[PDB]
Motif scaffolding. Structure first.
Motif, PDB file in Angstrom:
ATOM      1  N   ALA A   1     -10.815   5.249   5.151  1.00 58.00           N
ATOM      2  CA  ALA A   1      -9.686   5.545   4.241  1.00 58.00           C
ATOM      3  C   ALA A   1      -8.884   6.690   4.842  1.00 58.00           C
ATOM      4  O   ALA A   1      -9.169   7.872   4.624  1.00 58.00           O
ATOM      5  N   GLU A   2      -7.900   6.318   5.658  1.00 59.89           N
ATOM      6  CA  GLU A   2      -7.163   7.283   6.446  1.00 59.89           C
ATOM      7  C   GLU A   2      -5.878   7.579   5.679  1.00 59.89           C
ATOM      8  O   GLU A   2      -4.945   6.788   5.713  1.00 59.89           O
ATOM      9  N   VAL A   3      -5.851   8.723   4.997  1.00 54.77           N
ATOM     10  CA  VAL A   3      -4.724   9.142   4.150  1.00 54.77           C
ATOM     11  C   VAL A   3      -4.179   7.981   3.331  1.00 54.77           C
ATOM     12  O   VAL A   3      -2.988   7.654   3.396  1.00 54.77           O
ATOM     13  N   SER A   4      -5.066   7.367   2.558  1.00 58.14           N
ATOM     14  CA  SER A   4      -4.710   6.210   1.760  1.00 58.14           C
ATOM     15  C   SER A   4      -5.192   6.428   0.336  1.00 58.14           C
ATOM     16  O   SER A   4      -4.394   6.487  -0.586  1.00 58.14           O
ATOM     17  N   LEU A   5      -6.504   6.583   0.179  1.00 64.14           N
ATOM     18  CA  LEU A   5      -7.087   6.984  -1.098  1.00 64.14           C
ATOM     19  C   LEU A   5      -6.520   8.317  -1.602  1.00 64.14           C
ATOM     20  O   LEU A   5      -6.592   8.605  -2.796  1.00 64.14           O
TER      21      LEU A   5
ATOM     22  N   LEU B   1      -4.632  14.184  17.279  1.00 63.35           N
ATOM     23  CA  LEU B   1      -5.914  14.611  16.718  1.00 63.35           C
ATOM     24  C   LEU B   1      -6.434  13.627  15.662  1.00 63.35           C
ATOM     25  O   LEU B   1      -7.636  13.393  15.541  1.00 63.35           O
ATOM     26  N   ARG B   2      -5.513  13.067  14.898  1.00 62.84           N
ATOM     27  CA  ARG B   2      -5.833  12.080  13.871  1.00 62.84           C
ATOM     28  C   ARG B   2      -6.324  10.775  14.512  1.00 62.84           C
ATOM     29  O   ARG B   2      -7.285  10.161  14.027  1.00 62.84           O
ATOM     30  N   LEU B   3      -5.673  10.347  15.601  1.00 62.41           N
ATOM     31  CA  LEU B   3      -6.166   9.199  16.353  1.00 62.41           C
ATOM     32  C   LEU B   3      -7.574   9.473  16.911  1.00 62.41           C
ATOM     33  O   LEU B   3      -8.457   8.617  16.845  1.00 62.41           O
TER      34      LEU B   3
ATOM     35  N   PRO C   1      -5.565  -8.961   0.722  1.00 64.97           N
ATOM     36  CA  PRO C   1      -4.759  -8.143  -0.179  1.00 64.97           C
ATOM     37  C   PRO C   1      -5.588  -7.624  -1.347  1.00 64.97           C
ATOM     38  O   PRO C   1      -6.436  -8.331  -1.910  1.00 64.97           O
ATOM     39  N   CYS C   2      -5.342  -6.372  -1.698  1.00 61.84           N
ATOM     40  CA  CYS C   2      -5.980  -5.777  -2.848  1.00 61.84           C
ATOM     41  C   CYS C   2      -5.229  -4.530  -3.226  1.00 61.84           C
ATOM     42  O   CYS C   2      -5.010  -3.654  -2.380  1.00 61.84           O
ATOM     43  N   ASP C   3      -4.839  -4.428  -4.493  1.00 59.13           N
ATOM     44  CA  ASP C   3      -4.403  -3.132  -5.011  1.00 59.13           C
ATOM     45  C   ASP C   3      -5.679  -2.371  -5.295  1.00 59.13           C
ATOM     46  O   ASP C   3      -6.401  -2.727  -6.228  1.00 59.13           O
ATOM     47  N   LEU C   4      -5.971  -1.336  -4.500  1.00 60.22           N
ATOM     48  CA  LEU C   4      -7.238  -0.605  -4.622  1.00 60.22           C
ATOM     49  C   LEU C   4      -7.431   0.113  -5.961  1.00 60.22           C
ATOM     50  O   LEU C   4      -8.537   0.541  -6.270  1.00 60.22           O
ATOM     51  N   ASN C   5      -6.369   0.240  -6.753  1.00 59.08           N
ATOM     52  CA  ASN C   5      -6.518   0.760  -8.118  1.00 59.08           C
ATOM     53  C   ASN C   5      -7.248  -0.196  -9.036  1.00 59.08           C
ATOM     54  O   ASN C   5      -7.718   0.206 -10.107  1.00 59.08           O
TER      55      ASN C   5
ATOM     56  N   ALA D   1       6.578   3.169  -3.316  1.00 58.39           N
ATOM     57  CA  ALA D   1       6.695   4.515  -2.763  1.00 58.39           C
ATOM     58  C   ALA D   1       5.458   4.892  -1.935  1.00 58.39           C
ATOM     59  O   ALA D   1       5.566   5.527  -0.887  1.00 58.39           O
ATOM     60  N   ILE D   2       4.289   4.498  -2.410  1.00 55.87           N
ATOM     61  CA  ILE D   2       3.057   4.759  -1.677  1.00 55.87           C
ATOM     62  C   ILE D   2       2.985   3.897  -0.402  1.00 55.87           C
ATOM     63  O   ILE D   2       2.582   4.378   0.666  1.00 55.87           O
ATOM     64  N   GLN D   3       3.403   2.640  -0.505  1.00 52.99           N
ATOM     65  CA  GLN D   3       3.466   1.782   0.675  1.00 52.99           C
ATOM     66  C   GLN D   3       4.394   2.369   1.729  1.00 52.99           C
ATOM     67  O   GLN D   3       4.164   2.230   2.932  1.00 52.99           O
TER      68      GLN D   3
ATOM     69  N   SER E   1       4.957   8.156  13.425  1.00 47.64           N
ATOM     70  CA  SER E   1       4.383   9.328  14.095  1.00 47.64           C
ATOM     71  C   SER E   1       3.329   8.921  15.127  1.00 47.64           C
ATOM     72  O   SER E   1       3.206   9.553  16.180  1.00 47.64           O
ATOM     73  N   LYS E   2       2.570   7.862  14.836  1.00 48.82           N
ATOM     74  CA  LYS E   2       1.578   7.385  15.795  1.00 48.82           C
ATOM     75  C   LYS E   2       2.280   6.802  17.007  1.00 48.82           C
ATOM     76  O   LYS E   2       1.842   7.001  18.126  1.00 48.82           O
ATOM     77  N   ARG E   3       3.383   6.100  16.772  1.00 45.60           N
ATOM     78  CA  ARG E   3       4.219   5.596  17.868  1.00 45.60           C
ATOM     79  C   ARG E   3       4.795   6.727  18.745  1.00 45.60           C
ATOM     80  O   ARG E   3       4.882   6.587  19.969  1.00 45.60           O
TER      81      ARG E   3
ATOM     82  N   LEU F   1      -9.193   0.601   4.532  1.00 48.46           N
ATOM     83  CA  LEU F   1      -8.785   0.646   3.137  1.00 48.46           C
ATOM     84  C   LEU F   1      -7.434   1.332   3.061  1.00 48.46           C
ATOM     85  O   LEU F   1      -7.333   2.538   3.264  1.00 48.46           O
ATOM     86  N   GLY F   2      -6.393   0.545   2.805  1.00 45.01           N
ATOM     87  CA  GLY F   2      -5.041   1.051   2.866  1.00 45.01           C
ATOM     88  C   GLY F   2      -4.603   1.120   4.319  1.00 45.01           C
ATOM     89  O   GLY F   2      -4.196   2.171   4.786  1.00 45.01           O
ATOM     90  N   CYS F   3      -4.693  -0.007   5.017  1.00 41.95           N
ATOM     91  CA  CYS F   3      -4.514  -0.051   6.472  1.00 41.95           C
ATOM     92  C   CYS F   3      -3.076   0.155   6.940  1.00 41.95           C
ATOM     93  O   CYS F   3      -2.852   0.497   8.104  1.00 41.95           O
TER      94      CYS F   3
ATOM     95  N   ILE G   1      -7.176  -4.142   4.583  1.00 42.86           N
ATOM     96  CA  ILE G   1      -6.851  -4.221   3.150  1.00 42.86           C
ATOM     97  C   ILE G   1      -5.668  -3.327   2.789  1.00 42.86           C
ATOM     98  O   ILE G   1      -5.675  -2.147   3.096  1.00 42.86           O
ATOM     99  N   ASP G   2      -4.649  -3.885   2.129  1.00 42.91           N
ATOM    100  CA  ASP G   2      -3.552  -3.078   1.587  1.00 42.91           C
ATOM    101  C   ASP G   2      -2.923  -3.888   0.458  1.00 42.91           C
ATOM    102  O   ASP G   2      -3.380  -4.983   0.146  1.00 42.91           O
ATOM    103  N   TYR G   3      -1.875  -3.347  -0.154  1.00 43.43           N
ATOM    104  CA  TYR G   3      -1.132  -4.100  -1.157  1.00 43.43           C
ATOM    105  C   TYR G   3      -0.574  -5.389  -0.561  1.00 43.43           C
ATOM    106  O   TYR G   3      -0.165  -5.421   0.594  1.00 43.43           O
TER     107      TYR G   3
END
Ligand code: SAH
Length: 672
Positions: free
Chosen positions: A208-212, A72-74, A179-183, A11-13, A22-24, A99-101, A130-132
Motif C-alpha cells: 500500500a504505497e501512499v494509497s491507504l 528513495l521511494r522506488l 477492480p475494487c473500491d478499497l472502502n 480526486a483520490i485517483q 514524479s517516478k517518470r 493495493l491502490g496501484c 487493485i484500484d478503482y
C-alpha cells in the motif's frame, strides 16, 4: 450525496497523476546515471529500459529534493521485495498484490525478461493490481494497446486498439488487474478469495504505497485486517507520518496541501508515529513488524550507491530532505514467524529542565529571505544575500526595536558588485567599519571562490583575494584580534582557515585532531572573547548522510603562527546532532543553540531551541509556546541570529512540493 463520493473518489485517483509523473522524472534523470547496482531497469547490453514512459504524456522535471525522495521511494519498495524474494524458497509462488496501484508499472518492470536487473522475479512471482474501476479501465487499455507491455504478460502485441474500453479487469498467467473500491471491505474480502490468496503454499506480499493514506483509519485498517487472515503474508505500507503532531512546521504545510487538493491524509491523523504503526499492525493481526522512516532507508543505502546518488544532479536542500524523510514511514509486517528481518534490512527502533532565565517571544522581522548572513557593525545591522526565492546580492540595513525590526535597502556605489549568492558568510571586520563576504554559491554546482569587502562609509564593494577552493555552507566567526575564522563547508579546501584581515592572507589552521579529517557543513560556530574559547556545534559531512553529535570547545592563540587553534574538549549529545543550526553566547557560561534539522528525528516545541553551559555541561530547554508553534509559520532552516537579547530572523523552506513556508521571526529575552 453520491456526487460527493464520486468527486472525492476521482480526486483520490488523481493523486496517481502526480506520483507517476514524479517516478517518470526519476526514470529520465536518475536511472541513466546509476550503475547496474541500482538501475532497476537495464538490458543485457547495459542499455536502460523504460516503463514509466508508457503512462506519462510529457517529459517530467521535479526539484532535486523531490527526485531524491522518489528515487528513495522506488528503492523502498524494491528493497522490501528483494528481501522477500531472496529468503523465500525458490519453489514457492509469490504474489505481489498492489493495493491502490494507480498506473505503477512495477509488475511489467519486474516480469520483463529483457530486464536483467529483475531476473529473480522472472519465474515464480505474479502480480495483482487493485484500484478503482475507472482508473483500471485506463490502465488496462494502455496495457493491451502497447506492444511492449502486452508482450511482457503474454497478450497479443499486434493490437493498437481494444474491442471494449470499459473492461476493468484483466487476467493473464502472471498478472491480474482487479477492480475494487478499497472502502468496501466486504468486496475486498471476496476478492481475496476469488484470487485464492488463502493458499498457504503461496507467499503473499500486500503493498500500500501512499494509497491507504487517503482512507479513513477504520477503512484502511479493515483492509489490513482482511489480509492478515491469509496465511503466509507480508504487508508493506509506505505513507505519511506527523511524528510531532499536525502543527509541526512541515506537517502543518503537508496536511494543508493534501486538503487543498481534496485528497486529505486521513489515516495519519490516527497513526502519527512509527510506534503507532507497530501497534496498529499488531492489533490487526501482523505480529512481526520491521519499520523505519525514509532517512533510515537513506542511511541503509550502501556507500557506492550513495556516492552515485550524490552525483546524479546538483542538490543542497538537506534540511528539506531531513524533514521530508521523517514524514514518510516504510513499514514491513508479516503474519508468520518463519520470515526473518535480516541484518541488511532491519530498521533500528529526555526531559530537559525548562530554562528559568530566558524566554522566546515573537518579534516580527519580515526580511523574508533565507541563507543570507548578517553582522553588526556598531549600532547597525547588515544582512546580505540569500534567496527569496531566487538569489540576491542585496544588503538590508536592520534597525532593531523591542517590538519589531525596521529594514531599508542600501544602495551600492561601485561599478563592480558580487554576484547574487546564498550560503556565504558576512562578517564584521576593520574596527566595525567593513564587512567581509566569503564564498557562497549560486546553484549547488556553482560554489564560489570570489570574496569581497563592503565598506559601510562609502557603500562600495571591492573584490579581494579569492579562495583557492570554492566553499559554501561554511561557518565563520570574528576573533578578538579582528581576524576571521572560517570552518568547513562544501569544499575541497582545508577544514579550517584563518583570514588575516590586515595581511590579506588565508592560513590553513586545521587543528591536529581527527575530527577535522572531513569538512564540516552547516555547523554552529561562535567565539567568546571573555572566556577566550569558542564552540563548534553539530554539522553534517559531505556524504550528506552523517551529522556530528558533538559540541567542540576550542581555543585560539593569536601568537601561535602554525597551530593557533586547539581542541579543549568534546561534548556529545543527541540534541547536538543538528545540520544548519546556529549558536550564540548569551553569556560566557550560556550558549544558545537554535534550530537546524537532524537525521535522527524531528525537533519539537521543547528541543528546537536549547541552552548549554559548556563548563558545567548542563542543558536546558527554551520552550516554544503552544501559541507560536500552532499559530505562526516557524521554520528554523536558513535563518540567522543577531544580537544588539537575540533575534532569530529570516529562514524558510520548500516542503517537498507541498508549498513553501517562511520563518516569521523570534526573539529571546531575559525573564524579569
Ligand atoms: N478506496 C480505494 N480503492 C481503490 N484504490 C484507491 C482507494 N483509495 C486510494 N486508492 C488509490 O491509491 C492510489 C494513490 S496514488 C499512488 C499509486 C501507486 N501506489 C504508486 O505509488 O505509484 C490512486 O491510484 C488511488 O486511486
Amino acid at each position: 450525496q453520491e456526487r460527493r463520493k464520486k468527486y472525492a473518489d476521482l480526486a483520490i485517483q488523481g493523486t496517481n497523476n502526480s506520483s507517476i509523473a514524479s517516478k517518470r522524472s526519476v526514470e529520465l534523470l536518475y536511472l541513466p546515471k546509476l550503475s547496474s547496482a541500482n538501475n532497476f531497469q537495464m538490458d543485457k547490453n547495459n542499455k536502460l529500459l523504460e516503463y514509466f514512459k508508457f503512462f506519462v504524456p510529457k517529459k517530467i522535471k521535479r526539484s532535486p529534493c523531490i527526485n531524491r525522495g522518489y528515487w528513495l521511494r522506488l528503492f523502498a519498495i524494491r528493497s522490501r521485495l528483494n528481501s522477500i524474494i531472496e529468503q523465500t524458497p525458490q519453489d514457492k509462488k509469490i504474489v505481489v498484490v498492489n493495493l491502490g496501484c494507480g498506473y505503477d508499472p512495477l509488475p511489467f518492470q519486474l516480469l520483463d525478461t529483457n530486464n536483467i536487473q529483475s531476473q529473480q522475479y522472472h519465474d515464480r512471482v505474479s502480480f495483482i493490481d487493485i484500484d478503482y474501476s475507472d482508473l483500471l479501465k485506463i490502465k488496462i487499455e494502455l496495457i493491451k494497446t502497447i506492444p511492449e507491455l502486452s508482450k511482457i504478460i503474454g497478450l497479443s502485441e499486434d493490437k493498437d486498439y481494444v474491442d471494449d474500453s470499459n473492461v476493468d479487469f484483466l487476467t493473464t498467467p502472471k498478472y491480474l488487474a482487479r477492480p475494487c473500491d478499497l472502502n468496501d471491505s466486504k468486496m475486498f474480502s471476496t476478492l481475496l478469495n476469488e484470487c485464492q490468496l488463502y493458499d498457504p503454499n503461496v507467499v503473499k506480499v500486500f503493498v500500500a504505497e501512499v494509497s491507504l493514506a487517503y482512507m479513513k483509519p477504520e477503512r484502511s485498517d479493515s483492509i489490513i485486517e482482511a489480509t492478515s487472515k491469509m496465511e503466509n503474508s507480508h504487508f508493506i505500507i509506505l505513507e505519511q507520518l506527523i511524528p510531532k503532531g499536525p502543527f509541526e512546521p512541515f506537517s502543518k504545510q503537508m496536511l494543508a496541501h493534501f486538503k487543498r487538493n481534496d485528497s486529505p491524509l486521513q489515516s495519519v491523523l490516527k497513526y502519527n508515529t512509527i510506534e503507532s504503526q507497530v501497534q496498529r499492525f499488531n492489533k490487526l493481526g501482523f505480529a512481526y513488524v520491521n519499520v523505519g522512516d525514509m532517512f533510515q532507508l537513506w542511511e541503509s543505502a550502501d556507500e557506492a550507491t550513495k556516492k552515485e546518488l550524490l552525483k546524479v544532479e546538483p542538490f543542497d536542500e538537506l534540511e528539506e530532505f531531513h524533514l521530508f524523510c521523517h514524514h514518510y514511514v516504510l513499514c514491513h509486517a508479516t503474519n508468520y514467524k518463519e520470515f526473518a528481518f535480516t541484518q541488511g534490512f532491519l530498521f533500528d527502533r529526555i526531559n530537559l529542565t525548562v530554562d528559568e532565565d530566558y524566554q522566546l517571544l515573537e518579534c516580527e522581522c519580515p526580511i523574508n529571505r533565507k541563507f543570507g548572513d548578517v553582522d553588526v557593525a556598531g549600532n547597525d545591522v547588515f544582512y546580505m544575500g540569500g534567496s527569496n526565492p531566487y538569489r540576491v546580492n542585496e544588503i538590508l540595513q536592520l534597525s532593531i526595536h523591542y517590538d519589531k525590526i525596521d529594514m531599508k535597502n542600501i544602495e551600492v556605489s561601485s561599478s563592480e558588485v558580487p554576484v547574487a549568492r546564498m550560503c556565504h558568510t558576512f562578517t564584521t571586520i576593520s574596527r566595525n567599519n567593513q564587512l567581509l563576504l566569503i564564498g557562497g554559491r549560486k546553484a549547488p554546482h556553482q560554489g564560489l571562490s570570489d570574496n569581497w569587502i563592503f565598506d559601510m562609509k562609502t557603500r562600495e564593494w571591492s573584490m579581494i583575494k579569492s579562495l583557492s577552493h570554492t566553499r559554501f555552507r561554511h561557518s565563520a566567526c570574528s576573533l578578538p584580534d579582528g581576524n576571521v575564522l572560517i570552518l568547513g563547508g562544501v569544499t575541497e579546501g582545508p577544514a579550517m582557515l584563518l583570514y588575516n584581515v590586515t595581511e590579506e592572507i588565508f592560513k590553513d589552521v586545521t587543528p591536529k585532531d581527527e575530527f577535522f579529517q572531513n569538512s564540516l557543513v552547516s555547523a554552529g560556530l561562535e567565539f567568546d572573547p571573555v572566556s577566550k574559547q569558542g564552540i563548534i556545534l553539530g554539522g553534517g559531512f559531505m556524504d550528506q548522510t552523517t551529522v556530528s553529535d558533538k559540541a567542540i570547545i576550542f581555543k585560539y592563540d593569536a601568537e601561535n603562527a602554525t597551530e593557533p587553534i586547539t581542541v579543549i574538549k568534546k561534548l556529545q549529545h543527541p540534541l547536538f546532532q543538528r545540520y544548519g543550526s546556529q549558536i550564540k553566547y548569551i553569556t560566557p557560561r550560556k550558549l544558545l543553540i537554535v534550530g537546524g534539522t537532524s537525521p535522527s528525528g524531528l525537533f519539537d516545541r521543547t528541543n528546537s531551541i536549547i541552552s548549554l553551559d559548556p563548563l558545567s555541561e548542563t542543558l536546558t530547554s527554551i520552550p516554544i509556546s503552544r501559541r507560536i508553534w500552532e499559530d505562526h509559520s516557524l521554520m528554523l532552516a536558513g535563518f540567522s541570529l543577531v544580537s544588539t537579547t537575540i533575534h532569530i530572523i529570516g529562514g524558510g523552506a520548500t516542503c517537498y512540493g507541498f508549498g513553501s513556508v517562511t520563518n516569521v521571526g523570534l526573539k529571546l529575552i531575559a525573564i524579569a
